Every structure is written in structure tokens, then in C-alpha cells.
């Protein structure tokens, strides 16, 4: 529209209206000119002695907007209002708007770097509505809209891995190259803006409640069962039985079973670090799955287990989501102690989910005879069974919202391991790049020009999300557990900027506070 007219306003807000809540976030972004306007074939061989690290892909000159983290939409107080009062929620719609674009020309001379705006430069933007591009958004990576509204952020560079040959850095006949310029995109000069809208598919509500009953103790503790159980064999081999008494939950017949489990090693946090094995390199003794001839770690394991047992300091670390308390630099290889990190605990699900670091149980391992005694053996892993129930991983304020279900034609219970909503058609990738501007070209050449004017753009982005809420409807008499701002002798305010302006966050806030009977 115009150089001296704003193409949009600043909208950050939450509006609660019954069973709906609309969140609005606006952030300032900055887009670098990645790769110098070129596509590059990126590849890697075996790194750290693991050929599962090998890949073949492409880095593109495009950047992308990632809105896949709860804190990009929810302030800590609104999150508290959500988890203390509702049984569940789910995304309904999304509206994105990119505006107030500013393209800057950078010029370095002799020890001098000036910056001036280029009023005629454009920025290109498109959304991948048909999912024709490798969707890299739901894999727990950096670059999402920052939690704290005033924080300015750089858009991450779009890249992808395709097929590599024999766990090496070579491509195969099936490796695919995708050209992002081969999509129709809108071009924006300083007065133009871009708007996009999207609606989520019917997805089940995330469960924001913990069970107030144990799965194996659902029977009335005052009445016996009209069922009998084999208890022994007489001195002559006659089978003997007894009635299952009231309250003896170790013996009652069960109708339902706990979800699938796969044993993972348990480690003690600090209080119990003296009981941990010393100097052990976890990779060699970790849970791994094989695929195409290589072994990959599979944290945080499939859903169905609890990583800790409420009241203990032992964690099944590979079944745990681990966040940094602060934003880290790219490529850091420092070894962090637990004092800098935020460990998540899924102990609220222990009345239903089995403990990840213990054996799942025991089964018969032979045929009993008058000469051979009955034998049992414990099992470390057990997959899904008919009539089994479990609770999915909880969502966190600083964790992912959705994940795209891989299109293969066959899947089971499409719920991403890192938590969130599994979607067949998630919010489309929104790509953006600075349109190239050639330097001073005087003569002709059939070779593509390589000399460009260095630029970078900036602007604002606003994301509006409507969420549907599930009202709590309990008849519990006594008070419930609530997430509360409880600190003893605070030296600073959590979820607030400190003296240096840095946003501080000392806790990973889950969703499970309210209870429900089974």
C-alpha cells in the first residue's frame, strides 16, 4: 500500500469465552539471506562413530516460521488458568499474518559496515498447503516464536535430508530434490502484507487430568468377587481353589491392563547420585532401534510408561523430555549437569502407566510335571494387548503442540512420542526468503550471476489460535492440587526478566493437576 503506512497492528492477547479461548501473539522477526541465495547439497558421513548420523540433503536459501511450541501462544499465567481449571483442550483454528516488512541493504567498505533501507526490495512468501515438501516442523527443533513477546528472533533456515546410500553421504536413485522456487509465492515490498488461515481436523482432546484411582484396584474393597482362583495343588496333585476376597487387589480378576512398556535404565538424580554407576557412557548401553542397517536412539520411547515413581529420585532418563532452562547457542557441546536443565516427570500417570525402569511382569516359561516344578520368567518389554489402557505423554508449556503423522498407509495410534496432537494435515510450512538483488553486472554471460547485494529483512508476525476447552465436572469434595507460584525466599521472579533483561524460567509446567476417578 505505502511506504509511510503501517500494514498491521500489534496483537498479543488471550480472550476466554466459555469453552473457547483465543490466543494472539505478535513477534518481531529478522530473516538473514541464507546461503547467499543458493541451494546446497549438504551431506555427512559417520559422526561420533555412528553411521546413523550419515545423511544426504539440501540446505535452501529459505527460512520458515515455526509456531509449534505452547509458550509461543500461552503466557505462563494463562497456562496456569488452563491447567488448574480444565480437563482438556485441543486446537481448532489458526490465522497467521506477516506485516510491516523492512528490507535492509548492508554495505561494508574499508572497516565500515553501513545499513540503509531498500524501499524497492521484496520478500517472497508461500505456504505448503498440499504437503508436497518435507515437513520439518514437528521434530522438536529450535527457531519457534519466542516465549517472551518483546524478544526479537531469527527465522531458522529450511533444509531437509532425503535418502542416502548404505548409511553413507551418497544419494540413491530415489533421492529427491525439491526446488522451493517451483511453488507460486507472494512477493512483498515494504507496504504489502501476507495473511493465511487454517482449521484443524477433528482431533481428540488432550487429557489434562491425573487418575485418582489405580487401574488394578477398581473393585469395591468391601465386597468379594464371585470368582475363585487356583492357589495350589494338594499332596496328591489335586488342583485347589479359593474365593477372591474383598480388598485383596493382588488376587482379584482384572478386566483391564496397563499399556505397553519397554524397559529403560533408571538413574538417580543428585540426592541419590552416590548410588549411580560411575563413569558410564550411555550410548553403548541405551535403548536403540535398527533401521536400514543402522542403530538410532529412540528417546523418549513410545507412549504407555511413566518415567518416574512419585516419591523417588530415580528417573528413566531416556523416557524423559529434557529442556534447557535457557536458550542455548547453536552447536554447543558442553556437558550440562542437572542444575541447568528442566527434567519432566510423568508420575501423575503411574496409577495407570507402568514404570519404565522396572520389569513389566512375569509369565510361565515351561510345562509343569510331577518331576518339573512350575517356572516363571520376567519380561522387559511388552507391546499392545487387547483391553489395555494407558495415558499419553503430558504436554508442557515449553514443549511441542503437534506432529505430522508420517504418510505410509499404515499406522497404529498416531500420537507422537514427544506429546501433542498427531495430525494428518498440520498447519502448513510457511516459507520466506529475501528476493535476490544482483550487484553491478556490466557484461553478458550465460553463467548465472553470483554477485548479489547483501540484504536482510525484518517484520512482524502475528499468530491467532482458537482452542476448544473441556470443562472439569467433578464431585470430588476435598480440595485439588493446583499449580501455584510457590518459591521459598525468591531472589528473582520466575517467568520474568532479570536484571540483565534475560527472561528466566525455572520450571517445566505440565498439564496434569486435576483428578478424575477411573
Amino acid at each position: 500500500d505505502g511506504v509511510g503506512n503501517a500494514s498491521g497492528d500489534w496483537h498479543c492477547d488471550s480472550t476466554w469465552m466459555g469453552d473457547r479461548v483465543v490466543t494472539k501473539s505478535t513477534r518481531t522477526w529478522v530473516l538473514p539471506s541464507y546461503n547467499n541465495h543458493q541451494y546446497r547439497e549438504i551431506k555427512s558421513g559417520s559422526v561420533d562413530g555412528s553411521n546413523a548420523n550419515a545423511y544426504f540433503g539440501y540446505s535452501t536459501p529459505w527460512g520458515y516460521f515455526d509456531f509449534n511450541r505452547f509458550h509461543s501462544h500461552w503466557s505462563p499465567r494463562d497456562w496456569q488458568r488452563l491447567i488448574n481449571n480444565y480437563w482438556g483442550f485441543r486446537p481448532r483454528s489458526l490465522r497467521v499474518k506477516i506485516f510491516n516488512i523492512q528490507v535492509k541493504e548492508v554495505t561494508v567498505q574499508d572497516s565500515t559496515t553501513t545499513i540503509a533501507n531498500n524501499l524497492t526490495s521484496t520478500v517472497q512468501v508461500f505456504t505448503d498447503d498440499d504437503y508436497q515438501l518435507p515437513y520439518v516442523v514437528g521434530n522438536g527443533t529450535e527457531g519457534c516464536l519466542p516465549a517472551f513477546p518483546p524478544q526479537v528472533f531469527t527465522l531458522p533456515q529450511y533444509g531437509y535430508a532425503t535418502l542416502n546410500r548404505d548409511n553413507g553421504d551418497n544419494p540413491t536413485e530415489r533421492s529427491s530434490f525439491f526446488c522451493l522456487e517451483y511453488f507460486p509465492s507472494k512477493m512483498l515490498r515494504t507496504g504489502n502484507n501476507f495473511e493465511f488461515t487454517y482449521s484443524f481436523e477433528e482431533v481428540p482432546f488432550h487429557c489434562s487430568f491425573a487418575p485418582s484411582q489405580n487401574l488394578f484396584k477398581l473393585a469395591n474393597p468391601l465386597v468379594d468377587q464371585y470368582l475363585y482362583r487356583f492357589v495350589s495343588t494338594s499332596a496328591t496333585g489335586a488342583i485347589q481353589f479359593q474365593k477372591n476376597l474383598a480388598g485383596r487387589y493382588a488376587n482379584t480378576y482384572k478386566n483391564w491392563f496397563p499399556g505397553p512398556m519397554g524397559r529403560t535404565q533408571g538413574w538417580n538424580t543428585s540426592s541419590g547420585s552416590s548410588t549411580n554407576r560411575v563413569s558410564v557412557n550411555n550410548f553403548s548401553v541405551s535403548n536403540r532401534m535398527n533401521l536400514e542397517g543402522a542403530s538410532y536412539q529412540v528417546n523418549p520411547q513410545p507412549n504407555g510408561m511413566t518415567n518416574t515413581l512419585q516419591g523417588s529420585n530415580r528417573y528413566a532418563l531416556e523416557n524423559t523430555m529434557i529442556f534447557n532452562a535457557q536458550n542455548a547457542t547453536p552447536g554447543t557441546t558442553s556437558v550440562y549437569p542437572e542444575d541447568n536443565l528442566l527434567l519432566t516427570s510423568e508420575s501423575e500417570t503411574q496409577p495407570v502407566n507402568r514404570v519404565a525402569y522396572n520389569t513389566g511382569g512375569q509369565m510361565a516359561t515351561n510345562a509343569q510335571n510331577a518331576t518339573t516344578a512350575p517356572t516363571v520368567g520376567t519380561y522387559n518389554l511388552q507391546e499392545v494387548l487387547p483391553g489395555s489402557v494407558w495415558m499419553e505423554r503430558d504436554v508442557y508449556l515449553q514443549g511441542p503442540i503437534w506432529a505430522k503423522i508420517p504418510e505410509t498407509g499404515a499406522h497404529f495410534h498416531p500420537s507422537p512420542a514427544m506429546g501433542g496432537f498427531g495430525l494428518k494435515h498440520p498447519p502448513p510450512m510457511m516459507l520466506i526468503k529475501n528476493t535476490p538483488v544482483p550487484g553491478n553486472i556490466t557484461s553478458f554471460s550465460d553463467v548465472p550471476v553470483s554477485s548479489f547485494i547483501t540484504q536482510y529483512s525484518t517484520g512482524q508476525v502475528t499468530v491467532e489460535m482458537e482452542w476448544e476447552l473441556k470443562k472439569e465436572n467433578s464431585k470430588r469434595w476435598n480440595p485439588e492440587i493446583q499449580y501455584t507460584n510457590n518459591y521459598n525466599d525468591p531472589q528473582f521472579v520466575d517467568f520474568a526478566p532479570d536484571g540483565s533483561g534475560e527472561y528466566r524460567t525455572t520450571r517445566a509446567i505440565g498439564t496434569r493437576y486435576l483428578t478424575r476417578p477411573l
Binding site: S111, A325, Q326, A328, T329, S334, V335, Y336, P337, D339, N340, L341, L342, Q491, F492, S500, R504, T505, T506
Partner: protein, 88 residues
């Protein structure tokens, strides 16, 4: 750049860190050091005294990892060092 790492334990925590740079200039030319705490424990409150000096003083250091980045620049000569501090 360098990467000097230090370590401390017990209750004591208050510590000071100096700054060493190669190609030392004449007396008439002094650099303006600048320290940035890029990593620290989630519990860290502490304070940083003398950031623009050669010695950065630290107090109230809780157990954890601390990452600093001292940048020493002058007349046609930019530089910077890295230091890791681990408290038990």
C-alpha cells in the same frame, strides 16, 4: 579463541576471573574488556562486578555450569576468550 575450563567445590563459591590476550599492546593502549554470562544454572541469581575490567568477580555461585565469553578489542584487533566454570 581459547577455551579454559575451571572447577570448584565445597560451600565456597565467590571467585574472580582474569583475562589473558595474545599480542599485548603498549602501555598507552588499554583494551575495554566485556564479559557476558551465556550459560548458568536455572537457580543462579548472583551478580557480576567489574565486567568492563580484566577481572570479573562472581558471588553467590550455586552448583552448575557457567559459560562466559570475554571479548577483548582495541585499535584494529578484535578478540575473545571462552571460560567454563563448574561448581559441585
Amino acid at each position: 579463541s581459547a577455551g579454559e575450563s575451571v572447577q570448584i567445590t565445597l560451600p565456597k563459591n565467590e571467585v574472580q576471573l582474569n583475562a589473558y590476550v595474545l599480542q599485548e599492546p603498549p602501555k598507552g593502549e588499554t583494551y575495554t574488556y566485556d564479559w557476558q554470562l551465556i550459560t548458568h544454572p536455572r537457580d543462579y541469581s548472583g551478580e557480576m562486578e567489574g565486567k568492563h575490567s580484566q577481572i570479573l568477580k562472581l558471588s553467590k555461585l550455586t552448583p552448575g555450569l557457567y559459560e562466559f565469553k570475554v571479548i577483548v578489542e582495541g585499535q584494529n584487533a578484535h578478540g575473545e576468550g571462552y571460560v567454563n566454570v563448574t561448581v559441585k
